[PDB]
Amino acid sequence: ITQVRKEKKGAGMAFATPEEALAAYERGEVALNAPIVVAGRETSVGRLKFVFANPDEALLAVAHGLLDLQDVVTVRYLGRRLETSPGRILFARIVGEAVGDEKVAQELIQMDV
Amino acid sequence: RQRDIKDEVWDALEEVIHGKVVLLNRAPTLHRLGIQAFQPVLVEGQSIQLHPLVCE
Amino acid sequence: EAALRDLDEEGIVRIGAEVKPGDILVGRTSFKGEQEPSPEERLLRSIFGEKARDVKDTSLRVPPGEGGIVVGRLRLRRGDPGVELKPGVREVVRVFVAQKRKLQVGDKLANRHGNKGVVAKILPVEDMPHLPDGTPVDVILNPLGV
Amino acid sequence: ERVVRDSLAALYAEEDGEVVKVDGTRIAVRYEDGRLVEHPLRRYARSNQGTAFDQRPRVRVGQRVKKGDLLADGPASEEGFLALGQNVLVAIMPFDGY
Amino acid sequence: FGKRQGEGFGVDKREKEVLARAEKLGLVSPGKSPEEQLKELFDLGKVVLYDGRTGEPFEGPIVVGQMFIMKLYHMVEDKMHARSTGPYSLITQQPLG
Amino acid sequence: AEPGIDKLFGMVDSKYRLTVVVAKRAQQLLRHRFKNTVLEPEERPKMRTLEGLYDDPNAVTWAMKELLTGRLFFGENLVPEDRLQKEMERLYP
Amino acid sequence: KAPVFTATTQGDHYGEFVLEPLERGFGVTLGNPLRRILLSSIPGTAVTSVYIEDVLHEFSTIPGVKEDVVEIILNLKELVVRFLDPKMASTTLILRAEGPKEVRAGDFTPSADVEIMNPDLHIATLEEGGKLYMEVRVDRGVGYVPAERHGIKDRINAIPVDAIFSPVRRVAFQVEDTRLGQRTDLDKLTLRIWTDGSVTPLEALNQAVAILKEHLNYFANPEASLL
Amino acid sequence: KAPVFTATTQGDHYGEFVLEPLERGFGVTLGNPLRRILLSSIPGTAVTSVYIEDVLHEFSTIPGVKEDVVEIILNLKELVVRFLDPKMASTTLILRAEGPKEVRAGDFTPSADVEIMNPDLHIATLEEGGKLYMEVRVDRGVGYVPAERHGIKDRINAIPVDAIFSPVRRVAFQVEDTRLGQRTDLDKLTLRIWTDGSVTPLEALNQAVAILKEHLNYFANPEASLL
């Protein structure tokens, strides 16, 4: 779960607006987790695609087949806007719910790797 | 005599069992961790069930 | 009475009798070393009035963890042709007991390639990783051993 | 094959002939040489370790056997081949830490 | 698969899912129909497996097939023993082995 | 397991002291049939059984919760041993 | 809207039940549970307790019979017997064979209420003078219960055999893309059921859904707590 | 036999449900479908669109407000309302705020049949001289529908928002082996349910099993075409 996918199909393709990257994904010219440059910022298709206000929504979208846990997206977690994977947030919540305090859990876990 | 064993004696067995622990041993014994305390849990089958973490 | 069931004539178990651990395969009686019953003991003996008798029970009973059905029967008694038995010994009685053993939790399984293993819990046919044609798999081995 | 043959745990045809009977005790064969030879079958004999030694005949009554041809299998034999374990359908994968 | 379509069945949706995620990680050549991808996966030894507990397919493809497996001498039947109070040796009072 | 074990570790310097304490307390409890307890009916460690939910016959657990309360006093040369056991039997038949 | 339920069967052995359209992912949500309860809890048949005249135990060798009693019993587990009466919880099938013939499941002495769904099932080969008297006691129930569990005692030499009750041999289901929706991504559920013939796949499906429903209304009025 | 069903809940948000004792294999059989249903089925709340002032683009910043458009959109996805009538499948909520203000969901201008069950929530932070007018479009739906699926402009520059429909946050059940007398193998089914509070987990559960048995009643009338 904590391992994140990277595809080479997009291959750092540049777009002016997120819409071009979007349509480019529809068409299959640019991969999901493939690193791309939208506007001047560097991001991924999935990061613009899936933006969640909370872990529960993310896991709902994932468990419904719209997304996989290994994909890089954007999510709002513990008062922070993060670009990470659903399975990782899952991990953090596993540890937190195991200990009972997700705050100190998140404090001592590496969410980077 | 006569392995008459009935739910009475099994539930009584779990009456004496409760809260008490037994020592598990694996040869060769190198560490002290080669012996660790665990609980009786009555289970069908003749094999002893061990936790996956303490295996190491 | 009930423990003497399958013992038909000479005190040997019949052919095709299930023998539980503790059940008597063949009966035998050996005179006890003559000694007093203890005061409490003889108080009991008097209470039940059951005659303290001579011989005591030496009978062979199948060991714990073992049991099955009786197939073979062999009796070699001395004073009979074809057999010479060692001095002091009257007769030897031997019983074949066969067991039907299905695969059980904890039994060992392995392949020709040197992959060992123990049976860890059996799984009902209901939940199995199966094929699209409904054909379930028979084992589920772990790749991490490879 | 040769394993089950040289193990002598199986019954074969000593010469050319015909099976005149089966059942689980005596497989009788009338050989070309004219002699009628029955082969007694050992059924469920206790071994050293306790593993049963058994011989199951595969021949129909009345078909003519060649010489060296199989009559009855061994405990570890199937139609003249070594049968040790069984062939099962395996899936290689982690299952619930079991 | 020929017998699958002979019985009037196409490719299952769950199989399309597994084939998709196998395609993303590149176990099958992109652009090829689900039949040819299931084909490319099949000769790899890996097929699509459904979990009998859920009914949902396993994320990755899993090798299955016929293995020759052996029951051996050691059994729990013979090797399980426990004791409370039994006989003891005459010389020293240690229990027997 | 044995909940509160961390706090129990914190109660004493050396662990073996704690073990001795729990041992002797469980001993007292087994002696007097759980009538010397400092616990209250709600705090009593109840074993779940279909026949009914009873007092946990395990004295060790009882001693654990007992020391977890803090109503128990422990130490070296605290009271004379003889008088201790003496009036110990004096209180509870 | 209302899904169109079609049932296309074959014989008493095979059946195919198509339900479409359905919600996204629902084909699994339905298909799998029914498959489980099918393969497990469907009430069966398949004997109990076998006796042969000269046989004191399962490993005895019967004169005139090429097969040992354990292989014959092994073939007696494969015997599919159907009751025509829901009232009969048990019965006894009698079989007698002589001479150089081959004893099969269709050679049993016929009786009311009982029928063999596989008359070509091989029991034993009988040679010259081979005479086999056999009586099988067929009870019926649900699931897989080994012989080592149930006691019998019905006669001194009576032999307990393993019992596979559930009439369902195998169940598969396929979820596909249905043309029958307002939208895309809708499921067509196809239930493929293979049974021995004691119970038709349709009946099996019926009582499976019934059991599932009964276990479904097990959720009623619970007891409440608020920590 | 007859299983005991118990329910331990907390507030209108959280709930726990235990079915036990239960026959083997049935714990998962019940567990998975209800889990799939609760997330993919139960009817609901959840805004579809949002229109805002002086912003024509989804990524473009808003003067006078600390949070950008996206953050506001997220906070609006967190917002949970309730309809007081079945007749209304859609509505429109309005909001206007000026000057230094902490803008909550309670400051949202009310509507006829629309009741906000989330009065205390953080929508936006308005600085000195901050001007905010917005009209959010809240429709009624099920499961989860992304902004990609249905984009919605009933307004000139309306921003389609991911609509999280199902009132159920997360399910996450568990089965464990429990014992009664002899047999240690029985299914103890512990089903936890998280919801937003529009419906209490008990209601969501009963409604779910209602949907399930409704789908199970879909096997009634067979039409036989024999291959």
Side-chain angles (χ1 to χ4, degrees), chain E residues 53-54 56, chain H residues 28 32 36:
Chain E
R53 323 184 293 195
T54 69
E56 298 176 338
Chain H
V28 197
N32 251 272
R36 296 172 62 85

Side-chain angles (χ1 to χ4, degrees), chain B residues 3-4 11-12 18 21-22 24 26-28 33-34 36 47 51:
Chain B
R3 47 176 46 174
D4 60 334
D11 293 28
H18 182 274
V21 310
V22 292
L24 242 57
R26 160 70 204 280
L33 274 304
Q36 294 178 44
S47 7
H51 201 261

Side-chain angles (χ1 to χ4, degrees), chain B residues 7-8 11 14-21 32 39, chain F residues 1-2 16 46-50 54 56-58 61:
Chain B
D7 319 332
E8 294 194 7
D11 293 28
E14 270 245 349
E15 259 192 343
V16 273
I17 273 169
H18 182 274
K20 269 192 169 181
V21 310
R32 68 179 184 183
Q39 257 182 330
Chain F
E2 277 70 25
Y16 308 99
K46 260 39 189 174
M47 179 182 63
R48 52 171 58 207
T49 307
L50 2 142
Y54 260 2
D56 187 32
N58 181 274
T61 321

Side-chain angles (χ1 to χ4, degrees), chain B residues 1-4 44-49, chain C residues 20-21 61 64-65 104-107 119:
Chain B
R1 318 176 175 186
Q2 171 75 150
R3 47 176 46 174
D4 60 334
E44 322 288 57
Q46 306 199 347
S47 7
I48 301 174
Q49 302 189 19
Chain C
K20 214 64 157 303
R61 308 185 188 186
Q104 195 179 358
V105 183
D107 284 342
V119 170

Side-chain angles (χ1 to χ4, degrees), chain G:
Chain G
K1 298 177 297 131
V4 181
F5 168 65
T6 75
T8 274
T9 61
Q10 189 60 259
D12 290 340
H13 52 282
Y14 193 23
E16 295 190 13
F17 313 93
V18 178
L19 185 62
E20 62 174 273
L22 271 181
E23 222 65 31
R24 185 162 118 200
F26 272 29
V28 188
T29 303
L30 304 185
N32 182 264
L34 286 184
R35 176 185 183 276
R36 301 180 54 81
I37 310 170
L38 258 150
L39 299 170
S40 66
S41 297
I42 295 297
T45 64
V47 85
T48 290
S49 177
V50 189
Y51 172 81
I52 289 86
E53 47 163 327
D54 292 23
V55 168
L56 296 86
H57 60 71
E58 218 174 62
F59 298 152
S60 300
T61 105
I62 314 174
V65 184
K66 157 182 167 185
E67 263 75 0
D68 46 38
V69 192
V70 76
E71 192 157 272
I72 298 177
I73 279 179
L74 191 64
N75 295 280
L76 285 166
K77 288 185 54 180
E78 300 295 324
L79 171 63
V80 41
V81 29
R82 188 199 177 188
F83 285 21
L84 300 180
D85 197 31
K87 294 292 306 102
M88 260 190 177
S90 178
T91 198
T92 132
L93 280 72
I94 314 297
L95 168 60
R96 239 296 180 90
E98 290 86 1
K101 76 194 307 175
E102 282 191 350
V103 200
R104 53 184 85 112
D107 290 14
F108 275 76
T109 302
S111 176
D113 272 332
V114 288
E115 108 215 57
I116 280 79
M117 311 300 297
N118 53 350
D120 304 334
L121 199 74
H122 194 280
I123 296 299
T125 50
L126 258 56
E127 62 174 22
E128 233 87 294
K131 302 189 180 306
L132 175 61
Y133 171 66
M134 179 188 301
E135 58 168 13
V136 294
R137 278 186 81 238
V138 178
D139 304 332
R140 66 204 234 108
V142 41
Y144 168 75
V145 47
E148 295 76 0
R149 329 236 305 200
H150 68 81
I152 343 193
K153 188 247 163 283
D154 270 75
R155 191 142 42 73
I156 189 68
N157 283 331
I159 301 177
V161 324
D162 295 90
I164 315 172
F165 290 154
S166 57
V168 38
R169 194 140 314 191
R170 61 181 99 107
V171 170
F173 74 94
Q174 192 158 354
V175 174
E176 297 166 310
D177 295 313
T178 173
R179 170 186 300 209
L180 263 165
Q182 303 96 345
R183 56 180 73 99
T184 141
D185 66 87
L186 299 183
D187 297 15
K188 31 179 289 185
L189 201 170
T190 316
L191 260 180
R192 324 176 63 177
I193 307 183
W194 286 278
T195 68
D196 50 19
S198 334
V199 162
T200 85
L202 199 140
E203 301 174 7
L205 180 56
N206 281 126
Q207 47 201 6
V209 177
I211 290 178
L212 180 50
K213 180 181 180 180
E214 182 186 9
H215 282 262
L216 192 55
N217 42 19
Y218 279 168
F219 300 83
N221 11 319
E223 310 169 33
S225 63
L226 302 136
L227 295 174

Side-chain angles (χ1 to χ4, degrees), chain D residues 33-78:
Chain D
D33 52 84
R35 226 170 61 257
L36 256 110
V37 182
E38 83 145 44
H39 301 298
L41 303 168
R42 259 190 184 88
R43 301 307 292 253
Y44 310 106
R46 151 160 173 78
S47 64
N48 303 331
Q49 298 79 359
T51 58
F53 177 79
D54 195 35
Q55 300 168 347
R56 282 186 303 256
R58 311 300 239 281
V59 265
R60 82 166 52 163
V61 200
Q63 67 179 342
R64 21 208 69 222
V65 293
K66 224 53 196 171
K67 90 160 183 277
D69 223 339
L70 180 67
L71 304 185
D73 282 319
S77 183
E78 214 181 35

Side-chain angles (χ1 to χ4, degrees), chain C residues 16-60:
Chain C
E18 270 97 353
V19 282
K20 214 64 157 303
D23 275 339
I24 302 179
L25 299 179
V26 305
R28 180 156 79 219
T29 71
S30 320
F31 309 101
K32 98 175 198 306
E34 63 169 37
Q35 291 295 155
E36 45 102 296
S38 76
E40 299 85 15
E41 225 182 359
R42 202 198 296 277
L43 176 60
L44 207 284
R45 304 266 174 174
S46 218
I47 262 62
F48 284 90
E50 192 177 46
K51 154 83 158 58
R53 207 182 77 189
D54 269 271
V55 96
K56 270 291 297 297
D57 177 37
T58 30
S59 66
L60 186 67

